[PDB]
UniProtKB/Swiss-Prot annotation:
Protein name: Phospholipase A2, major isoenzyme
Modified how: Acylation causes dimerization.
Top-tier EC class: hydrolase
Main location: secreted
Full-sequence portion shown in this chain: 23 to 146 of 146
Organism: Sus scrofa
Source superkingdom: Eukaryota
Function summary: Secretory calcium-dependent phospholipase A2 that primarily targets dietary phospholipids in the intestinal tract. Hydrolyzes the ester bond of the fatty acyl group attached at sn-2 position of phospholipids (phospholipase A2 activity) with preference for phosphatidylethanolamines and phosphatidylglycerols over phosphatidylcholines. May play a role in the biosynthesis of N-acyl ethanolamines that regulate energy metabolism and inflammation in the intestinal tract.
Amino acid sequence: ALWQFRSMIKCAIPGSHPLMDFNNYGCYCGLGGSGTPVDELDRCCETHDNCYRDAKNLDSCKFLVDNPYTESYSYSCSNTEITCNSKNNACEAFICNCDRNAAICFSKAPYNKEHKNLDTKKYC
Ligand SMILES: [Ca+2]
């Protein structure tokens, strides 16, 4: 599962904190969800969960294969500049390219300080 995704979001977050703060927060973190976010740091979970919808379903390695999240792959870093193991393949390159705009996008969006274990009668 997404466990070297924690390895991933140290790399692309100069400043902000991963999962420990980033996992419980905001409204629609999961497959579908459609209201909107609360702040757009539920909106960086919007992009990685719908890139993951196309990854659980994927033409390069189709799912008699069984390779869902972070098990075989690892990655690269620096600006925020996350990618993959830089010889990067077809389907191993896709699941690490969704976990890229997970790690990068926690530094692109705002943050839920607020929705941080949420309320959403309110936000969604
Ligand atoms: Ca969603």
